[PDB]
Design a binder for this molecule. Structure first.
Ligand SMILES: C[C@H](CS)C(=O)N1CCC[C@H]1C(=O)O
Ligand SMILES: [Zn+2]
Ligand SMILES: [Zn+2]
Length: 228
């Protein structure tokens, strides 16, 4: 782990790093959230902001120091603060931003700034490619409603990594966390659909646990079975 200001960065693969940021949530403690940073040749791609604009600017500072290539785009994985709280920092930096159309719709009411571009998805869950131009190795999949109605997931081609965002918890998690915005009927199926979309991914990265094996997916889905 590299501590960089109040954030933590961890290399996961030759071209992939996890960013971690923290927010004091009165009544919960200081909650970690993870996203990703991917180098694709001469550019960098970001998955999720940090909780705040200031923290997100720090991600960009770390990128400048440790990679020193332009950030071509960011994709954010639903309209909650841990994933979209730093949108303004990305925009101030001139970075093109992408989210599920539904996330952009929900952003204002959730207290978020919308991304500049909207992703749309085929019936089978795969992103419509024209809406995700120049995404390089990022393979974006809508697994169905679960943690939220708008949650999306991202595989990284050329690696063993798939990112479940807040949909997936690790194999030892005691619960699925706050289900206030969740689709309890469909959660289990959505978790399993994520697994089926990225069947060869052996490292599952997620927002609120450290990277784990595919047991994160099976355990998450099994816990979600109980919501029905
Ligand atoms: C505010 C975030 C948005 S995904 C959240 O709901 N969290 C963060 C950690 C788990 C869960 C919770 O509070 O129950
Ligand atoms: Zn969330
Ligand atoms: Zn979250």
């Amino acid at each position: 782990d590299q501590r960089f200001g109040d954030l933590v960065f961890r290399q996961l693969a030759p071209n992939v790093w996890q960013h971690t940021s923290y927010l004091d949530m009165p009544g919960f403690g200081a909650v970690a959230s993870n996203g990703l940073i991917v180098r694709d040749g001469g550019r960098v791609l970001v998955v999720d902001t940090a909780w705040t604009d200031d923290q997100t600017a720090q991600i960009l500072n770390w990128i400048k120091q440790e990679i020193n290539l332009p950030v071509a785009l960011a994709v954010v994985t639903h309209a909650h603060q841990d994933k979209m709280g730093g949108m303004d920092a990305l925009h101030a930096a001139g970075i093109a931003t992408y989210a599920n159309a539904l996330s952009n719709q929900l952003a204002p009411q959730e207290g978020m700034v919308a991304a500049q571009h909207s992703l749309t998805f085929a019936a089978n869950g795969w992103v419509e490619p024209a809406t995700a131009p120049n995404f390089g190795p990022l393979k974006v999949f809508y697994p169905g409603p679960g943690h939220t109605s708008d949650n999306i997931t991202v595989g990284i081609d050329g690696t063993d990594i798939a990112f479940g965002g807040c949909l997936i918890k690790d194999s030892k998690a005691k619960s699925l966390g706050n289900l206030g915005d969740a689709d309890t009927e469909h959660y289990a199926a959505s978790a399993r659909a994520f697994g089926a979309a990225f069947p060869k991914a052996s490292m599952i990265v997620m927002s609120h646990s450290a990277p784990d094996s595919r047991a994160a997916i099976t355990h998450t889905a099994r816990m979600a079975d109980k919501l029905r």
